[PDB]
């Protein structure tokens, strides 16, 4: 299967899509934005 498929390495980078990382809130997540 290869090493690429055995480990669930993320294909996409989530940090690129985001705006202004200082205004990020971790502890609630029930919404996409």
């Amino acid at each position: 299967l290869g090493y690429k498929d055995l480990a669930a390495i993320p294909k996409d980078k989530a940090i690129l899509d985001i705006e202004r990382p200082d205004l990020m809130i971790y502890e609630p997540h029930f919404t996409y934005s």
Partner: protein
């Protein structure tokens, strides 16, 4: 609902499916299948048979019995055999496997995969 544990859970469920599919192919040579990775490894007989299949040698036969202490000895035999073949393990004990810690048993399966690729 924190991002940390959410990302952790999605990676764990993907790896839990993949490792079950991997162990079933090797365990199909004997007449054994693993329905669930966390629940079917608490007795330790399946781990003994999996290492017996992969290593090419036989292990000491497991102690009988449905007790907790018997399960602890059963998984300790497999862990001792893994320590025999120069395989390095950190923070891995019999009560960790028997109790059912998810990350530790997944790391155990991953370590066996990397040793016996």
């Amino acid at each position: 609902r924190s991002r940390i544990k959410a990302l952790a859970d999605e990676r764990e469920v993907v790896q839990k499916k993949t490792f079950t599919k991997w162990v079933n192919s090797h365990l199909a040579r004997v007449s054994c299948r693993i329905t669930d990775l966390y629940k079917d490894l608490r007795d330790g007989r399946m781990l003994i048979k999996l290492l017996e299949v992969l290593s090419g040698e036989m292990l000491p036969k497991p102690t009988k019995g449905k007790m907790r202490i018997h399960c602890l000895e059963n998984v300790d035999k497999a862990l001792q055999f893994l320590k025999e073949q120069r395989v390095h393990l950190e923070n891995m004990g019999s009560h960790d496997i028997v109790d059912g810690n998810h990350r530790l048993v997944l790391g155990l399966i991953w370590t066996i995969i990397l040793r016996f690729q």
